[PDB]
Amino acid sequence: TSDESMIETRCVLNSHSTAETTLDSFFSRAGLVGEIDLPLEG
Amino acid sequence: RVADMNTQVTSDESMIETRCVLNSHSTAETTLDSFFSRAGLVGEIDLPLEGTTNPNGYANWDIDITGYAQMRRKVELFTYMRFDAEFTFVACTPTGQVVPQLLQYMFVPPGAPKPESRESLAWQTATNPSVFVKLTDPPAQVSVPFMSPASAYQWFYDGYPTFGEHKQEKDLEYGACPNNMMGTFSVRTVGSSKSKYALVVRIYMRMKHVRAWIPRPMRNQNYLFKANPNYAGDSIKPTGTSRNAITTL
Amino acid sequence: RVADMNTQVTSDESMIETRCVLNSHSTAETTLDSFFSRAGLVGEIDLPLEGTTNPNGYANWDIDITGYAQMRRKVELFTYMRFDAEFTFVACTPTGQVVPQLLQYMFVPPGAPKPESRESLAWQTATNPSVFVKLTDPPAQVSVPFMSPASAYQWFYDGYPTFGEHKQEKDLEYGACPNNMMGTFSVRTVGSSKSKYALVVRIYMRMKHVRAWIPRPMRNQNYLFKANPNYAGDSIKPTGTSRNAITTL
Numbered sequence: 001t002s003d004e005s006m007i008e009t010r011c012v013l014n015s016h017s018t019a020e021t022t023l024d025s026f027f028s029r030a031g032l033v034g035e036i037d038l039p040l041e042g
Numbered sequence: 043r044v045a046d047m048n049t050q051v052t053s054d055e056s057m058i059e060t061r062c063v064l065n066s067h068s069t070a071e072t073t074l075d076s077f078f079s080r081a082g083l084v085g086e087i088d089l090p091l092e093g094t095t096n097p098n099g100y101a102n103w104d105i106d107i108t109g110y111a112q113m114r115r116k117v118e119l120f121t122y123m124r125f126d127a128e129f130t131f132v133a134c135t136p137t138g139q140v141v142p143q144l145l146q147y148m149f150v151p152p153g154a155p156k157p158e159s160r161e162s163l164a165w166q167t168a169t170n171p172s173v174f175v176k177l178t179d180p181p182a183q184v185s186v187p188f189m190s191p192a193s194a195y196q197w198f199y200d201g202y203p204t205f206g207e208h209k210q211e212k213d214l215e216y217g218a219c220p221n222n223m224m225g226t227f228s229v230r231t232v233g234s235s236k237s238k239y240a241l242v243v244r245i246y247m248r249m250k251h252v253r254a255w256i257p258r259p260m261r262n263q264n265y266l267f268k269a270n271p272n273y274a275g276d277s278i279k280p281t282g283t284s285r286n287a288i289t290t291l
Numbered sequence: 292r293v294a295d296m297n298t299q300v301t302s303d304e305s306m307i308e309t310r311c312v313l314n315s316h317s318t319a320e321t322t323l324d325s326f327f328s329r330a331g332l333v334g335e336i337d338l339p340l341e342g343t344t345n346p347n348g349y350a351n352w353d354i355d356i357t358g359y360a361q362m363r364r365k366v367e368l369f370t371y372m373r374f375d376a377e378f379t380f381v382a383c384t385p386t387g388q389v390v391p392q393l394l395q396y397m398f399v400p401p402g403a404p405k406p407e408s409r410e411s412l413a414w415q416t417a418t419n420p421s422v423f424v425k426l427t428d429p430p431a432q433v434s435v436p437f438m439s440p441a442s443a444y445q446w447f448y449d450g451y452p453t454f455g456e457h458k459q460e461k462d463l464e465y466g467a468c469p470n471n472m473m474g475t476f477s478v479r480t481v482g483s484s485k486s487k488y489a490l491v492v493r494i495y496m497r498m499k500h501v502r503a504w505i506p507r508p509m510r511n512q513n514y515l516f517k518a519n520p521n522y523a524g525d526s527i528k529p530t531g532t533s534r535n536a537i538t539t540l
């Protein structure tokens with residue numbers, strides 16, 4: 001509850017960016033989605 | 043209700059008589075962005091064919107740049123040190139040969155699963171930053187940001203990470219600030235079967251946008267262990283060369 | 292950079308129907324300056340001829356107004372109580388006779404020497420406030436200020452005066468606030484030889500400019516010891532009279 005109704009708080013300047021929790025940050029990372037085998041004798 | 047709540051005609055002047063000297067001498071090469079933005083060897087990864095070091099074609103190199111004396115002494119001139127890093131990986135045969143082998147560098151941040159094998163499912167790198175590159179390609183260069191939870195990296199941590207009583211079994215935790223260990227750098231040969239080439243991955247790291255804070259004395263003793271200021275006590279050498287007498291050179 | 296540093300037409304109205312009543316009823320007699328500015332017996336001093344109480348013609352009465360139940364219960368309605376006192380001393384024979392005897396009342400504040408005899412050198416009263424008066428004279432009346440180091444007198448002191456561990460031998464110090472003990476009230480017969488009259492000095496004390504703060508429950512038990520809320524545990528009586536049954540009167 002925004003830390004105010006539970007404890008006494010000081011002023012904190014939250015220069016904490018939320019840009020890394022976006023979908024374009026959480027999902028724009030290449031991951032293995034397919035492996036194709038082209039063997040010689042298999 | 044309480045009210046209590048450039049030489050001109052010790053700056054060379056007080057010691058000798060001086061002429062006017064126009065000092066067009068730039069200080070731009072002594073900056074941190076000049077002294078530290080030079081890539082140095084911070085890691086070497088061995089992927090041999092018959093050796094017992096990394097025989098399965100994969101290796102998990104814990105990110106610790108204090109493994110080589112040159113760059114370790116360079117960065118250990120300070121304690122607190124915030125920078126972005128240009129990481130370069132020069133993969134080659136132990137004979138120096140450039141073999142047609144495909145490798146997968148993978149940055150494994152703390153908490154991410156370290157691969158237990160060459161064909162591990164952690165190599166799918168759906169969220170981990172990973173590099174796919176051949177040895178015939180030029181060395182893989184990546185820009186690594188300042189990733190520490192702290193405001194700067196900390197080559198000297200006078201303290202312990204955890205609480206509780208610190209016995210001799212937990213004495214290895216001294217100086218190990220987890221603001222500096224940033225997971226492992228995982229290398230594999232991308233394939234089900236064992237690679238036919240012995241491989242050496244040399245990590246060269248160049249720090250950009252460097253900020254460093256607290257200068258300490260340099261390292262005048264031989265480094266022995268990574269992230270450890272331990273020195274050979276029975277072979278302490280002086281900071282420099284010696285003289286047969288003080289009245290002579 | 293932080294920003295954190297008189298009845299008219301429950302006031303008789305919600306229960307019954309009321310008429311308008313002009314309440315010209317003064318509240319001036321229920322004030323502290325009305326309830327407490329009445330002199331009461333706070334001390335009796337015996338100076339007999341053959342008794343062992345004060346046989347030498349002098350007495351040192353420690354100032355403690357909790358010696359008589361009426362005024363003690365009056366003032367003990369509160370804890371904190373700041374006032375100036377009108378002290379009256381009615382000296383007489385134990386038979387009530389008014390004898391031609393000269394007495395010396397002497398206020399001995401804490402630190403001042405208590406007289407060890409009738410002819411003590413403390414009776415020179417060069418700094419101590421002292422009263423010289425005959426028994427044939429009217430009772431000696433003096434205005435005593437508010438002399439406490441505290442902001443009010445304190446008939447109940449929930450604590451100890453000194454520090455350190457409080458054993459059973461030091462248990463008598465409980466409730467003894469030295470903001471209230473104001474030395475002794477010393478009486479003598481002014482003379483080298485023993486007075487020929489048995490004497491009784493009755494201290495009557497009237498408090499003026501009274502300020503009292505914290506009302507407590509009154510005293511519903513019999514007082515036993517001065518400056519002590521001790522009660523007879525095996526003979527605890529109720530606050531009032533009893534009834535044979537609750538459905539009857």
Ligand SMILES: CCCCCCCCCCCCC/C=C/[C@H](O)[C@H](N)CO
Binds near residue numbers: 105147197
């Ligand atoms: C795709 C590869 C990405 C590589 C990411 C590398 C992370 C760079 C972090 C470098 C910061 C210092 C690392 C550790 C510091 C020291 O060696 C010791 N812990 C302190 O003595």
Ligand SMILES: CCCCCCCCCCCCC/C=C/[C@H](O)[C@H](N)CO
Binds near residue numbers: 519
């Ligand atoms: C010339 C005679 C002067 C007489 C001076 C008398 C001083 C008056 C001080 C009265 C204040 C209270 C005295 C003590 C209070 C209580 O009896 C107990 N200490 C508390 O229970």
